[PDB]
Design a protein around this nucleic acid. Structure first.
Ligand SMILES: NC(=[NH2+])NCCC[C@H](N)C(=O)O
Ligand SMILES: [Mg+2]
Ligand SMILES: [Mg+2]
Ligand SMILES: [Mg+2]
Ligand SMILES: [Mg+2]
Ligand SMILES: [Mg+2]
Ligand SMILES: [Mg+2]
Ligand SMILES: [Mg+2]
Ligand SMILES: [Mg+2]
Ligand SMILES: [Mg+2]
Ligand SMILES: [Mg+2]
Ligand SMILES: [Mg+2]
Ligand SMILES: [Mg+2]
Ligand SMILES: [Mg+2]
Ligand SMILES: [Mg+2]
Ligand SMILES: [Mg+2]
Ligand SMILES: [Mg+2]
Ligand SMILES: [Mg+2]
Ligand SMILES: [Mg+2]
Ligand SMILES: [Mg+2]
Ligand SMILES: [Mg+2]
Ligand SMILES: [Mg+2]
Ligand SMILES: [Mg+2]
Ligand SMILES: [Mg+2]
Ligand SMILES: [Mg+2]
Ligand SMILES: [Mg+2]
Ligand SMILES: [Mg+2]
Ligand SMILES: [Mg+2]
Ligand SMILES: [Mg+2]
Ligand SMILES: [Mg+2]
Ligand SMILES: [Mg+2]
Ligand SMILES: [Mg+2]
Ligand SMILES: [Mg+2]
Ligand SMILES: [Mg+2]
Ligand SMILES: [Mg+2]
Ligand SMILES: [Mg+2]
Ligand SMILES: [Mg+2]
Ligand SMILES: [Mg+2]
Ligand SMILES: [Mg+2]
Ligand SMILES: [Mg+2]
Ligand SMILES: [Mg+2]
Ligand SMILES: [Mg+2]
Ligand SMILES: [Mg+2]
Ligand SMILES: [Mg+2]
Ligand SMILES: [Mg+2]
Ligand SMILES: [Mg+2]
Ligand SMILES: [Mg+2]
Ligand SMILES: [Mg+2]
Ligand SMILES: [Mg+2]
Ligand SMILES: [Mg+2]
Ligand SMILES: [Mg+2]
Ligand SMILES: [Mg+2]
Ligand SMILES: [Mg+2]
Ligand SMILES: [Mg+2]
Ligand SMILES: [Mg+2]
Ligand SMILES: [Mg+2]
Ligand SMILES: [Mg+2]
Ligand SMILES: [Mg+2]
Ligand SMILES: [Mg+2]
Ligand SMILES: [Mg+2]
Ligand SMILES: [Mg+2]
Ligand SMILES: [Mg+2]
Ligand SMILES: [Mg+2]
Ligand SMILES: [Mg+2]
Ligand SMILES: [Mg+2]
Ligand SMILES: [Mg+2]
Ligand SMILES: [Mg+2]
Ligand SMILES: [Mg+2]
Ligand SMILES: [Mg+2]
Ligand SMILES: [Mg+2]
Ligand SMILES: [Mg+2]
Ligand SMILES: [Mg+2]
Ligand SMILES: [Mg+2]
Ligand SMILES: [Mg+2]
Ligand SMILES: [Mg+2]
Ligand SMILES: [Mg+2]
Ligand SMILES: [Mg+2]
Ligand SMILES: [Mg+2]
Ligand SMILES: [Mg+2]
Ligand SMILES: [Mg+2]
Ligand SMILES: [Mg+2]
Ligand SMILES: [Mg+2]
Ligand SMILES: [Mg+2]
Ligand SMILES: [Mg+2]
Ligand SMILES: [Mg+2]
Ligand SMILES: [Mg+2]
Ligand SMILES: [Mg+2]
Ligand SMILES: [Mg+2]
Ligand SMILES: [Mg+2]
Ligand SMILES: [Mg+2]
Ligand SMILES: [Mg+2]
Ligand SMILES: [Mg+2]
Ligand SMILES: [Mg+2]
Ligand SMILES: [Mg+2]
Ligand SMILES: [Mg+2]
Ligand SMILES: [Mg+2]
Ligand SMILES: [Mg+2]
Ligand SMILES: [Mg+2]
Ligand SMILES: [Mg+2]
Ligand SMILES: [Mg+2]
Ligand SMILES: [Mg+2]
Ligand SMILES: [Mg+2]
Ligand SMILES: [Mg+2]
Ligand SMILES: [Mg+2]
Ligand SMILES: [Mg+2]
Ligand SMILES: [Mg+2]
Ligand SMILES: [Mg+2]
Ligand SMILES: [Mg+2]
Ligand SMILES: [Mg+2]
Ligand SMILES: [Mg+2]
Ligand SMILES: [Mg+2]
Ligand SMILES: [Mg+2]
Ligand SMILES: [Mg+2]
Ligand SMILES: [Mg+2]
Ligand SMILES: [Mg+2]
Ligand SMILES: [Mg+2]
Ligand SMILES: [Mg+2]
Ligand SMILES: [Mg+2]
Ligand SMILES: [Mg+2]
Ligand SMILES: [Mg+2]
Ligand SMILES: [Mg+2]
Ligand SMILES: [Mg+2]
Ligand SMILES: [Mg+2]
Ligand SMILES: [Mg+2]
Ligand SMILES: [Mg+2]
Ligand SMILES: [Mg+2]
Ligand SMILES: [Mg+2]
Ligand SMILES: [Mg+2]
Ligand SMILES: [Mg+2]
Ligand SMILES: [Mg+2]
Ligand SMILES: [Mg+2]
Ligand SMILES: [Mg+2]
Ligand SMILES: [Mg+2]
Ligand SMILES: [Mg+2]
Ligand SMILES: [Mg+2]
Ligand SMILES: [Mg+2]
Ligand SMILES: [Mg+2]
Ligand SMILES: [Mg+2]
Ligand SMILES: [Mg+2]
Ligand SMILES: [Mg+2]
Ligand SMILES: [Mg+2]
Ligand SMILES: [Mg+2]
Ligand SMILES: [Mg+2]
Ligand SMILES: [Mg+2]
Ligand SMILES: [Mg+2]
Ligand SMILES: [Mg+2]
Ligand SMILES: [Mg+2]
Ligand SMILES: [Mg+2]
Ligand SMILES: [Mg+2]
Ligand SMILES: [Mg+2]
Ligand SMILES: [Mg+2]
Ligand SMILES: [Mg+2]
Ligand SMILES: [Mg+2]
Ligand SMILES: [Mg+2]
Ligand SMILES: [Mg+2]
Ligand SMILES: [Mg+2]
Ligand SMILES: [Mg+2]
Ligand SMILES: [Mg+2]
Ligand SMILES: [Mg+2]
Ligand SMILES: [Mg+2]
Ligand SMILES: [Mg+2]
Ligand SMILES: [Mg+2]
Ligand SMILES: [Mg+2]
Ligand SMILES: [Mg+2]
Ligand SMILES: [Mg+2]
Ligand SMILES: [Mg+2]
Ligand SMILES: [Mg+2]
Ligand SMILES: [Mg+2]
Ligand SMILES: [Mg+2]
Ligand SMILES: [Mg+2]
Ligand SMILES: [Mg+2]
Ligand SMILES: [Mg+2]
Ligand SMILES: [Mg+2]
Ligand SMILES: [Mg+2]
Ligand SMILES: [Mg+2]
Ligand SMILES: [Mg+2]
Ligand SMILES: [Mg+2]
Ligand SMILES: [Mg+2]
Ligand SMILES: [Mg+2]
Ligand SMILES: [Mg+2]
Ligand SMILES: [Mg+2]
Ligand SMILES: [Mg+2]
Ligand SMILES: [Mg+2]
Ligand SMILES: [Mg+2]
Ligand SMILES: [Mg+2]
Ligand SMILES: [Mg+2]
Ligand SMILES: [Mg+2]
Ligand SMILES: [Mg+2]
Ligand SMILES: [Mg+2]
Ligand SMILES: [Mg+2]
Ligand SMILES: [Mg+2]
Ligand SMILES: [Mg+2]
Ligand SMILES: [Mg+2]
Ligand SMILES: [Mg+2]
Ligand SMILES: [Mg+2]
Ligand SMILES: [Mg+2]
Ligand SMILES: [Mg+2]
Ligand SMILES: [Mg+2]
Ligand SMILES: [Mg+2]
Ligand SMILES: [Mg+2]
Ligand SMILES: [Mg+2]
Ligand SMILES: [Mg+2]
Ligand SMILES: [Mg+2]
Ligand SMILES: [Mg+2]
Ligand SMILES: [Mg+2]
Ligand SMILES: [Mg+2]
Ligand SMILES: [Mg+2]
Ligand SMILES: [Mg+2]
Ligand SMILES: [Mg+2]
Ligand SMILES: [Mg+2]
Ligand SMILES: [Mg+2]
Ligand SMILES: [Mg+2]
Ligand SMILES: [Mg+2]
Ligand SMILES: [Mg+2]
Ligand SMILES: [Mg+2]
Ligand SMILES: [Mg+2]
Ligand SMILES: [Mg+2]
Ligand SMILES: [Mg+2]
Ligand SMILES: [Mg+2]
Ligand SMILES: [Mg+2]
Ligand SMILES: [Mg+2]
Ligand SMILES: [Mg+2]
Ligand SMILES: [Mg+2]
Ligand SMILES: [Mg+2]
Ligand SMILES: [Mg+2]
Ligand SMILES: [Mg+2]
Ligand SMILES: [Mg+2]
Ligand SMILES: [Mg+2]
Ligand SMILES: [Mg+2]
Ligand SMILES: [Mg+2]
Ligand SMILES: [Mg+2]
Ligand SMILES: [Mg+2]
Ligand SMILES: [Mg+2]
Ligand SMILES: [Mg+2]
Ligand SMILES: [Mg+2]
Ligand SMILES: [Mg+2]
Ligand SMILES: [Mg+2]
Ligand SMILES: [Mg+2]
Lengths: 141, 77, 110, 203, 59
RNA sequence: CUGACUGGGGCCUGUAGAGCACUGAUAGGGCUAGGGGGCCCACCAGCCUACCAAACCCUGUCAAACUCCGAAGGGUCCCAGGUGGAGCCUGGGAGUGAGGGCGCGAGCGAUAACGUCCGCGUCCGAGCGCGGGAACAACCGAGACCGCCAGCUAAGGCCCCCAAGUCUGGGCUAAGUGGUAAAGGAUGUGGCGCCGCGAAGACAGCCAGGAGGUUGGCUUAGAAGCAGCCAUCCUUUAAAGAGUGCGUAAUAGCUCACUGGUCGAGUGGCGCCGCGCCGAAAAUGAUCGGGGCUUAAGCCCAGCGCCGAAGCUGCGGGUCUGGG
RNA sequence: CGCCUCCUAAAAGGUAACGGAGGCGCCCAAAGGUCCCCUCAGGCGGGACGGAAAUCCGCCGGAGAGCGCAAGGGUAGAAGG
RNA sequence: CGAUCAACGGAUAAAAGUUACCCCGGGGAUAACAGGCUGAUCUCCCCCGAGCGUCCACAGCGGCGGGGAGGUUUGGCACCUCGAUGUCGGCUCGUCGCAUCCUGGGGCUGAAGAAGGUCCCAAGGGUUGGGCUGUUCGCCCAUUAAAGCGGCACGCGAGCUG
RNA sequence: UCCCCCGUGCCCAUAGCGGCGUGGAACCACCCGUUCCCAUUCCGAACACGGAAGUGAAACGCGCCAGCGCCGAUGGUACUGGGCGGGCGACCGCCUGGGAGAGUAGGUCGGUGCGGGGGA
């Protein structure tokens, strides 16, 4: 599943989740999109579960666009150790997601199909979501 | 479990020491820096560690000359 | 993209300007040779001399010398004594050297 | 075809106040003029959804004027996904750079074989006269297989309109579909753990 | 033109530079009023502690 | 008179935000070295790639140790305000060198801890003195010299316990929600918008009909609209998908969409906001502090009045400092 | 466990944790002073042996090379040759 | 000029262990018990509906993911207690919770009946004797309507055992 | 004080790349030579000297062109000093003062000082 092929640094500070998305807020490829209503660290496994849910629904046909990437290493100390002795080990990767982000887009599929696939995908994610359709507003971006 | 980090060096207290319009005496250090972030201008010398300092009594003046760099001048009083 | 000529010029001139003396610049064409004494602090020329202006004639070296002597005479008239030689892109040699020597014979200080 | 939208002049009114009153703040400009305006949000929305940045919107000003415009820019509220501002570009007799809708005529052979038509550009950037704005530009995609592509060079352009992007710019492509039969290989696909770029004496 | 400044809300809990502004204005007790000349330097301290203070323009 | 703080002016800065020009990351597409693979050759070349892909370009993004950009602020100097239990100089005497809570900014931790470690601020410490918060060092209010059976306020309050409104006007809630929780679920209720379909008679019900090629094919062992696909084409039509679901071992059958009739005015599906409902199990006896409260004594918007402290005022007194 | 560089570090300075990453305990008789001269990496095309890369030629190429060694700053109008 | 005085502001020119035979001064400034805060871990309950179940997503199940509750596990933290809060297990004596083992009442069933499965209501009462082992737990023997799980300082040593 | 050229500064790409055109009387350059001064890790390419037949081909100067590069508003937004609220939290808002970056409109094929030589 998704993770950087390589990196400059093994571990990242945690940082913050203030604000609406920096960018990525308009449908840019497909006909429909899944937009983030709440901030979260979205894991690579969450992203993949969402993906697989959509291709499983489509069976054959359609195209999925995954517009977020988990490049942020997630860290956890080995179980039952005390505080100190350095930063925990990298256990996984997450994509930072803030409200308004279009996480996924679909194309090549009917409206009924896209609505349903994106719904099922949403249930795999730790945040509230909204289904949207490409607009003149998107096109003008 | 342990760390192979934990090192850092002493802070070097670099930067401009006398800002534009300040009255300095000859020898007064004007800038501590690595390399020439500022270049010596009129009545300003430069030491082996890029330290800018006033060659005369006077008033400090800065000047940004684009691609030619930022300069520090001293204007005689 | 600068040229060897342009770099060489900047290099020797920058060094001169740091000392803050009046600057004796010398231009040497295939035919003529020119000198102006420059105040780089006001960005103004103080006194000038050339083979083209003096209608000098003969051997380029002997000419250079003469324009040097000439520049000196006019310079001393304005109270200009000490100066710094700006050979620019030219080697200190031949025509430029001659002009320099002619300037010195006139009592220009350098 | 051509749309009409009542606009109004604004001076010092706070954008927030206007927006809370259901008014969409905006600006209209060109090399000759620059004016702060506002339009009724829902009225604007009815228009823009049809007109987009493609079709001319003439603004009926309160001083009796009527200026032909193109929407140059719409600023979206990133959180709420809503327009918060409009740039109206006031047209004049000069040629103008603008976006013209691409209309994809035909069903790609690739699509019949199960593929998907990715419409990379849904409009194309073009210089043209305001008097000359076409409504669309057709493209024949029925020849495209999985995975073939069309470029802006393959665009057959109507009279008086000139491509304003590189002919190299790709405008459509026909891609392979999603397939569950691939899921299993992807799931049992092992990834090599990330390599960390060497610092220091190691490069 | 002058400013009548009344201290109406306590500086306890507020940053020390606001406490100092009050001292520059000569305001030391709650409900205390001072009539100060309207100069930018004074206006600057009055505005700094506006949330503590009640201002009126006088004469 | 130099102080904290403040006005103006100049200089210094690389954070917030943003961006992708550099260092790296990055999905897709295009283009295109390099391989994998397939045709075709050992005669050394050719052709095809829904294969993994470098560089490049496009669209779209990511970054404490990235920056083409870049604030608010912050720092410092000058002039001016600033007479303060301000400042500077010399010297005598210390104590302290276990801090803690809270707000904001980060790191560590698990977008844990009455956690831990720094930064800016604050309060407790030392204000466990006073009012509010049921009770409660650090939340809100406020810096207690003494006295008064006087007045005004703060936060918080004004149905009774309990001082002051069972105060006034508009709305919402029916859950005692108020008076502890989430994904998620729902013809709870209300307000806005958006659509359709309707007196070319809709929706609901009740009436019929709902059909041929055709048990259609990639197609396999049953596959007859209703076990996967890379299929949906037409015929007779008023109408009827090569089919909504129930159904069958497949069949058949029921039904939908569907068109006609019967009634005669609305009907169905979206979306945005307010308040509620479920989701909601833990150990001695319960409870919003209690009583008790429903056009509230709840929630939202707008008001007038009052109560309320050791704050402020009135009156009297002390002491120190300053001025007479 | 001292020292250097970057980040954490909240755009002056400073700032902690058994926080995130790397270095030093040398070296150079020139790798020092000065005067003079010179300008890179890389891409493309061309050239016996010669190759992805040896040396040569042309064009483009502001600095992405170089600067003994970590990192940062600086730097060709040289600190590089 | 002689310093890996590198524990790098460098105690001597010169230095390792052990104490369950231990001792004093102190600390709840700091660990082990219990409590507390937290809930990663643990236990339980949900959301999604891939797929299983001859046929049929939901009788019984529930891929990949998502949200919680509890405070019985193992921990994190170090907040009262180190001028003492006796720590496992048993016995005795109970009492409470309910996520119910049985008995009572229900819905669904892939419920013919009988017997089950699964969920809902329900804490009134009940929930055996024995072999092993310090055991808690667990395995086993013989039964049973059933042989429930947890809290009470892992309830209870000024009640006993040890 | 006007136009052209030659020097030399300043602003520091609105000045740059590319394309095209233009200039030799003057000036500048290439150029003609390598005796002499001086010079090449080889080379008169460079540096240097002595020249004056030729050419503005190269370079340079001066125009024009917006393909690139560079510059770039006004609006609106993010963010925020100070002041307030809300959420159990991740976080979300209001007031006042400040206010980007991206992008859009558009701008740009330089401007200017001093001294020379020439022209009117
Ligand atoms: N200086 C300011 N006004 N800052 C505004 C930020 C404050 C607050 N977080 C808000 O979003 O409104
Ligand atoms: Mg952190
Ligand atoms: Mg997580
Ligand atoms: Mg972590
Ligand atoms: Mg441990
Ligand atoms: Mg750690
Ligand atoms: Mg960790
Ligand atoms: Mg993970
Ligand atoms: Mg995001
Ligand atoms: Mg979700
Ligand atoms: Mg964009
Ligand atoms: Mg180590
Ligand atoms: Mg460290
Ligand atoms: Mg160290
Ligand atoms: Mg440090
Ligand atoms: Mg330091
Ligand atoms: Mg440092
Ligand atoms: Mg500085
Ligand atoms: Mg020196
Ligand atoms: Mg040096
Ligand atoms: Mg200045
Ligand atoms: Mg000066
Ligand atoms: Mg709208
Ligand atoms: Mg090294
Ligand atoms: Mg206060
Ligand atoms: Mg006070
Ligand atoms: Mg307060
Ligand atoms: Mg303040
Ligand atoms: Mg301050
Ligand atoms: Mg007071
Ligand atoms: Mg007031
Ligand atoms: Mg004073
Ligand atoms: Mg001062
Ligand atoms: Mg001061
Ligand atoms: Mg000030
Ligand atoms: Mg940021
Ligand atoms: Mg980048
Ligand atoms: Mg871009
Ligand atoms: Mg970030
Ligand atoms: Mg960023
Ligand atoms: Mg940083
Ligand atoms: Mg940054
Ligand atoms: Mg800028
Ligand atoms: Mg500033
Ligand atoms: Mg300041
Ligand atoms: Mg200032
Ligand atoms: Mg003063
Ligand atoms: Mg005094
Ligand atoms: Mg004092
Ligand atoms: Mg004092
Ligand atoms: Mg004393
Ligand atoms: Mg004493
Ligand atoms: Mg002490
Ligand atoms: Mg002491
Ligand atoms: Mg100590
Ligand atoms: Mg201490
Ligand atoms: Mg302590
Ligand atoms: Mg501390
Ligand atoms: Mg501490
Ligand atoms: Mg805090
Ligand atoms: Mg707050
Ligand atoms: Mg904080
Ligand atoms: Mg930090
Ligand atoms: Mg603490
Ligand atoms: Mg905390
Ligand atoms: Mg914390
Ligand atoms: Mg504190
Ligand atoms: Mg104490
Ligand atoms: Mg207090
Ligand atoms: Mg205090
Ligand atoms: Mg107290
Ligand atoms: Mg009390
Ligand atoms: Mg209290
Ligand atoms: Mg109280
Ligand atoms: Mg009370
Ligand atoms: Mg309290
Ligand atoms: Mg407390
Ligand atoms: Mg108190
Ligand atoms: Mg007092
Ligand atoms: Mg009153
Ligand atoms: Mg009040
Ligand atoms: Mg009350
Ligand atoms: Mg009463
Ligand atoms: Mg009231
Ligand atoms: Mg009433
Ligand atoms: Mg209820
Ligand atoms: Mg209640
Ligand atoms: Mg309740
Ligand atoms: Mg919900
Ligand atoms: Mg509902
Ligand atoms: Mg509702
Ligand atoms: Mg109905
Ligand atoms: Mg069939
Ligand atoms: Mg049938
Ligand atoms: Mg509930
Ligand atoms: Mg009412
Ligand atoms: Mg009172
Ligand atoms: Mg008092
Ligand atoms: Mg009195
Ligand atoms: Mg007194
Ligand atoms: Mg006194
Ligand atoms: Mg720092
Ligand atoms: Mg820093
Ligand atoms: Mg700093
Ligand atoms: Mg700072
Ligand atoms: Mg200092
Ligand atoms: Mg350590
Ligand atoms: Mg080391
Ligand atoms: Mg040498
Ligand atoms: Mg040498
Ligand atoms: Mg090369
Ligand atoms: Mg080659
Ligand atoms: Mg070869
Ligand atoms: Mg080669
Ligand atoms: Mg370099
Ligand atoms: Mg020794
Ligand atoms: Mg070591
Ligand atoms: Mg030591
Ligand atoms: Mg030692
Ligand atoms: Mg040492
Ligand atoms: Mg030491
Ligand atoms: Mg030290
Ligand atoms: Mg010693
Ligand atoms: Mg010793
Ligand atoms: Mg000895
Ligand atoms: Mg020893
Ligand atoms: Mg020793
Ligand atoms: Mg011993
Ligand atoms: Mg022993
Ligand atoms: Mg022993
Ligand atoms: Mg023994
Ligand atoms: Mg013994
Ligand atoms: Mg003994
Ligand atoms: Mg013994
Ligand atoms: Mg003993
Ligand atoms: Mg003892
Ligand atoms: Mg002792
Ligand atoms: Mg003792
Ligand atoms: Mg303790
Ligand atoms: Mg200690
Ligand atoms: Mg302990
Ligand atoms: Mg313990
Ligand atoms: Mg303990
Ligand atoms: Mg323990
Ligand atoms: Mg334990
Ligand atoms: Mg215990
Ligand atoms: Mg414990
Ligand atoms: Mg206890
Ligand atoms: Mg307890
Ligand atoms: Mg707890
Ligand atoms: Mg929990
Ligand atoms: Mg919990
Ligand atoms: Mg857990
Ligand atoms: Mg649950
Ligand atoms: Mg379900
Ligand atoms: Mg099956
Ligand atoms: Mg079934
Ligand atoms: Mg299925
Ligand atoms: Mg289920
Ligand atoms: Mg599961
Ligand atoms: Mg969870
Ligand atoms: Mg869980
Ligand atoms: Mg517990
Ligand atoms: Mg426990
Ligand atoms: Mg523990
Ligand atoms: Mg525990
Ligand atoms: Mg522990
Ligand atoms: Mg403790
Ligand atoms: Mg403790
Ligand atoms: Mg502590
Ligand atoms: Mg103890
Ligand atoms: Mg005792
Ligand atoms: Mg005791
Ligand atoms: Mg005792
Ligand atoms: Mg005792
Ligand atoms: Mg029990
Ligand atoms: Mg129950
Ligand atoms: Mg039962
Ligand atoms: Mg039963
Ligand atoms: Mg039965
Ligand atoms: Mg049976
Ligand atoms: Mg049953
Ligand atoms: Mg039930
Ligand atoms: Mg019972
Ligand atoms: Mg009972
Ligand atoms: Mg029981
Ligand atoms: Mg038994
Ligand atoms: Mg026996
Ligand atoms: Mg036994
Ligand atoms: Mg046993
Ligand atoms: Mg036994
Ligand atoms: Mg056992
Ligand atoms: Mg066994
Ligand atoms: Mg039996
Ligand atoms: Mg039974
Ligand atoms: Mg228990
Ligand atoms: Mg326990
Ligand atoms: Mg235990
Ligand atoms: Mg016990
Ligand atoms: Mg027990
Ligand atoms: Mg016990
Ligand atoms: Mg005992
Ligand atoms: Mg016992
Ligand atoms: Mg006892
Ligand atoms: Mg006892
Ligand atoms: Mg007892
Ligand atoms: Mg006892
Ligand atoms: Mg016993
Ligand atoms: Mg024993
Ligand atoms: Mg010129
Ligand atoms: Mg050009
Ligand atoms: Mg020509
Ligand atoms: Mg030309
Ligand atoms: Mg000529
Ligand atoms: Mg001619
Ligand atoms: Mg010779
Ligand atoms: Mg000769
Ligand atoms: Mg030659
Ligand atoms: Mg030459
Ligand atoms: Mg000749
Ligand atoms: Mg030419
Ligand atoms: Mg030249
Ligand atoms: Mg132009
Ligand atoms: Mg710029
Ligand atoms: Mg811009
Ligand atoms: Mg603006
Ligand atoms: Mg704020
Ligand atoms: Mg926060
Ligand atoms: Mg905000
Ligand atoms: Mg604002
Ligand atoms: Mg403002
Ligand atoms: Mg900005
Ligand atoms: Mg801008
Ligand atoms: Mg240009
Ligand atoms: Mg010029
Ligand atoms: Mg000038
Ligand atoms: Mg002129
Ligand atoms: Mg002239």
């Amino acid at each position: 599943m998704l993770m950087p092929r390589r990196m400059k640094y093994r571990k990242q500070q945690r940082g913050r989740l203030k604000g609406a998305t920096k960018g990525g807020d308009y449908v840019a490829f497909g006909d429909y999109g899944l937009v983030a209503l709440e901030p979260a660290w979205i894991t690579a496994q969450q992203i993949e579960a969402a993906r697989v849910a959509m291709v499983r629904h489509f069976r054959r046909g359609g195209k999925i666009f995954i517009r977020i990437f988990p490049d942020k290493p997630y860290t956890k100390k080995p179980l039952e150790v005390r505080m100190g002795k350095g930063k925990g080990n990298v256990e996984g990767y997450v994509a930072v997601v803030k409200p308004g982000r279009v996480m996924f887009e679909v194309a090549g599929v009917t409206e009924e199909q896209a609505m349903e696939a994106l719904r099922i995908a949403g249930h795999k994610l730790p945040i509230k979501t909204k289904i949207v359709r490409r607009d003149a507003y998107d096109e003008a971006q | 479990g342990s760390t192979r980090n934990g090192r850092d060096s002493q802070a070097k207290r670099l930067g401009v020491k006398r800002y534009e319009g300040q009255v300095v005496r000859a020898g007064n250090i004007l800038v501590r820096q690595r390399g020439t972030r500022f270049k010596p201008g009129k009545n300003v010398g430069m030491g082996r560690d890029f330290t800018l300092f006033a060659l005369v009594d006077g008033v400090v003046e800065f000047q940004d000359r684009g691609r030619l760099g930022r300069y520090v001048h001293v204007r005689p009083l | 993209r600068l040229t060897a000529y342009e770099r060489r010029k900047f290099r020797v001139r920058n060094r001169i300007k740091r000392t803050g003396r009046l600057r004796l610049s010398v231009f040497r064409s295939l035919k003529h040779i020119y000198a102006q004494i420059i105040d780089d602090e006001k960005g103004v020329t103080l006194v000038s001399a050339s083979s083209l202006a003096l209608k000098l004639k003969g051997n380029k070296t002997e000419v250079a010398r003469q324009v040097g002597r000439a520049l000196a005479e006019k310079a001393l008239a304005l109270g200009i004594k000490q100066v710094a030689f700006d050979r620019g892109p030219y080697k200190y040699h031949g025509r430029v050297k001659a002009l320099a020597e002619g300037a010195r014979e006139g009592g220009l200080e350098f | 075809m051509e749309y009409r939208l009542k606009a109004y002049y604004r001076e010092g009114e706070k954008p927030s106040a206007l927006r809370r009153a259901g008014k969409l703040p905006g600006v209209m400009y060109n090399r000759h003029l620059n004016r702060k305006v506002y339009v009724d949000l829902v009225e604007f929305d009815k228009v823009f959804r049809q007109a987009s940045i493609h079709h001319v919107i003439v603004l009926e000003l309160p001083d009796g004027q009527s200026l032909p415009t193109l929407v140059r820019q719409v600023n979206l509220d990133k959180r709420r996904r809503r327009p918060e501002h409009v740039d109206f570009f006031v047209l004049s007799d000069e040629p103008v750079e603008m976006y013209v809708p691409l209309r994809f005529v035909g069903t790609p052979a690739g699509v019949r074989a199960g593929g998907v038509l990715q419409e990379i550009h849904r409009d194309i950037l073009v210089k043209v006269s305001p008097r000359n704005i076409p409504e669309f530009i057709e493209v024949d995609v029925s020849g495209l297989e999985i995975g073939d592509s069309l470029h802006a060079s393959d665009l057959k352009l109507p009279p008086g309109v000139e491509l304003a992007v590189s002919p190299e710019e790709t405008i459509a492509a026909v891609v392979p579909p999603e397939d569950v039969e691939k899921l299993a290989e992807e799931a049992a696909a092992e990834v090599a753990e990330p390599e960390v770029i060497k610092k220091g004496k190691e490069e | 033109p002058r400013l009548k400044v009344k201290l109406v809300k306590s500086p306890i809990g507020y940053p020390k530079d606001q406490k100092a502004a009050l001292k520059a204005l000569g305001l030391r007790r709650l409900q205390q009023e001072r009539v100060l000349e309207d100069t930018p330097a004074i206006r600057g301290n009055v505005e700094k502690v506006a949330h503590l203070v009640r201002v009126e323009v006088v004469e």
